[PDB]
């Protein structure tokens, strides 16, 4: 299970305005290769950060980090 973390600088991470960059980047992990289920955003107690699990890894993890960027836009991200 291939996990990424999004970050947010203003605002709790499920805050509404937020949603549809969690929307978008969710939707791009999902075409990542060998890829079959996203899990919804889980956000941690803190809302500082949405955590992304994705199921099934070298490829997919420097595909994300090449691919995902681009689709978070102003918004940190992180494949672990």
């Known amino acids: ?3 990424v973390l999004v970050r947010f600088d203003a605002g ?3 805050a509404p305005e ?3 960059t969690i929307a ?3 939707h791009r992990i999902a075409q990542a290769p060998n ?3 996203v899990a919804p ?4 107690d803190d809302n500082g950060s949405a ?3 994705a199921v099934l890894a070298r490829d997919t993890i420097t595909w ?5 960027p681009r689709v978070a836009g102003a918004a940190q991200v992180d494949v672990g």
Do not use: E
Not at 41 to 44: D, I, K, Q, Y
Not at 64 to 68: E, F, P, S, Y
């Open 64 to 68: 994300m980090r090449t691919q995902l």
């Open 12 to 14: 709790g991470a499920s």
């Open 24 to 26: 978008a980047i969710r």
């Open 1 to 3: 299970p291939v996990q």
């Open 51 to 53: 955590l992304l699990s």
């Open 41 to 44: 955003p889980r956000f941690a």
């Open 35 to 37: 890829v079959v289920s």
């Open 18 to 20: 937020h949603s549809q």
